[PDB]
Design a binder for this molecule. Structure first.
Ligand SMILES: c1ccc(-c2nnc(N3CCN(c4ncccn4)CC3)cc2-c2ccncc2)cc1
Ligand SMILES: c1ccc(-c2nnc(N3CCN(c4ncccn4)CC3)cc2-c2ccncc2)cc1
Ligand SMILES: Fc1ccc(-c2n[nH]cc2-c2ccncc2)cc1
Ligand SMILES: [Cl-]
Ligand SMILES: [Zn+2]
Length: 347
């Protein structure tokens, strides 16, 4: 067992191994609290996240296990992975807190887009990285489901990592988001059978914003969001309308004054046409015809970066736990096993 030390930061107390020094708070939320620290063992600057109320409910307990399982599995340059995980608990009985450690990423895509107007080269590189990470995530039968600028970490070298790839249709009001500018329309329609391309829709929205400096669809509610979307891409054709089982949703859409698809060249005026072509393949209303991450990587917009030999897929990921209905103490025990069995990556 390593030697731990205690300290209080803001209103959050922290108990971590001595290897981590100079903890300074970076921010907190529904997820947990995060501190930047210096890892004396590796010489790296790391981010240390203390989970918030990990075993409050079966929802938190299962989510704590899920995040740990996800982070332990993700080994890819464009996806956050685990440098370390620890608890000050000496045994299961006193197991109450989980701390996760990863490489420190000093900014997110919001800081980047707001503080400066990115060049086309930057847009290509950043979007390239997101897609390369999504290709990997998606290959493990994982859907991010909430991609947005504040979920994309970026460092001073313009290297990018996807974070938060750990929620589902939950019965809690913590972390509730009012309207989501980056969400696929099928999600705004509460479709229960969406596919991995919901993430591609988000990339499209993010990419648009990096090119124009404006949120593409700043809707105030789910319906306002959907109307802004249909204004750009036009109202659904016969083929897509036929895929809507929800009688009320289908009928509402059909009762809207019908709208044509806008010419993307007029909307994203001044943008690299290759960029506009890709945007158009990403922002397809029918998810069945939306481009995949793997296909997008091979789009001519990324010719400067695309390398099939260096766009890997993930090892098989066991999500069978997702269907389990267990007691809080069972999820806690499983999580504890995962902490104790963690093998750090080679330096
Ligand atoms: C790997 C990484 C870090 C460590 C480490 N472990 N314990 C450390 N001590 C623990 C005890 N030490 C102490 N002990 C008694 C009185 C006053 N101070 C304070 C700092 C420092 C350190 C430490 C080492 C290197 N740089 C900074 C801190 C051990 C292995
Ligand atoms: C291990 C250690 C830290 C993390 C980590 N977790 N969450 C992070 N974000 C910070 C804020 N982000 C956010 N903020 C506002 C709205 C929606 N999301 C959500 C969570 C950043 C980070 C983070 C921060 C800095 N560097 C790397 C990762 C994950 C695993
Ligand atoms: F107005 C819209 C917006 C999006 C969709 C949509 N795109 N892909 C799948 C769907 C969809 C929506 C609702 N139910 C089934 C499928 C359908 C209608
Ligand atoms: Cl995909
Ligand atoms: Zn909760």
């Amino acid at each position: 067992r390593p030697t731990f030390y205690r300290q209080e930061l803001n209103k959050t107390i922290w108990e971590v191994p001595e290897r981590y020094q100079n903890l300074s708070p970076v921010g907190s939320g529904a997820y947990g609290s995060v501190c930047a620290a210096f890892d004396t063992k590796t010489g790296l600057r790391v981010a240390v996240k203390k989970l918030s109320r990990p075993f409050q409910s079966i929802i938190h307990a299962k989510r704590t296990y899920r995040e740990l399982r996800l982070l332990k599995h993700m080994k890819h340059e464009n996806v956050i992975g685990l440098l370390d995980v620890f608890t000050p608990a000496r045994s299961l009985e006193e197991f109450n807190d989980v701390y996760l450690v990863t490489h420190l990423m000093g900014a997110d895509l919001n800081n980047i887009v707001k503080c400066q107007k990115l060049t086309d080269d930057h847009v290509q590189f950043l979007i390239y990285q997101i897609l390369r990470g999504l290709k990997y995530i998606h290959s493990a039968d994982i859907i991010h489901r909430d991609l947005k600028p504040s979920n994309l970490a970026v460092n001073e070298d313009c290297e990018l990592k996807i974070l938060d790839f750990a929620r589902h249709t939950d019965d809690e009001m913590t972390g509730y988001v009012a309207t989501r500018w980056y969400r696929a329309p099928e999600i705004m329609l509460n479709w229960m059978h969406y596919n991995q391309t919901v993430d591609i829709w988000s990339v499209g929205c993010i990419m648009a914003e990096l090119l124009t400096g404006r949120t593409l669809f700043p809707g105030t509610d789910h319906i306002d969001q959907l109307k802004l979307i249909l204004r750009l891409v036009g109202t659904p054709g016969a083929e897509l309308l036929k895929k809507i089982s929800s009688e009320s949703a289908r009928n509402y859409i059909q009762s809207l004054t019908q709208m044509p698809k806008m010419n993307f060249a007029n909307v994203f005026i001044g943008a690299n046409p290759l960029a506009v072509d890709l945007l158009e393949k990403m922002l397809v209303l029918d998810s069945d015809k939306r481009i995949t991450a793997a296909q997008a990587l091979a789009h001519a917009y990324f010719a400067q970066y695309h390398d099939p030999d260096d766009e890997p897929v993930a090892d098989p990921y066991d999500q069978s736990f997702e269907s389990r209905d267990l007691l809080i103490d069972e999820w806690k025990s499983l999580t504890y096993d995962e902490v104790i069995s963690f093998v750090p990556p080679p330096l």
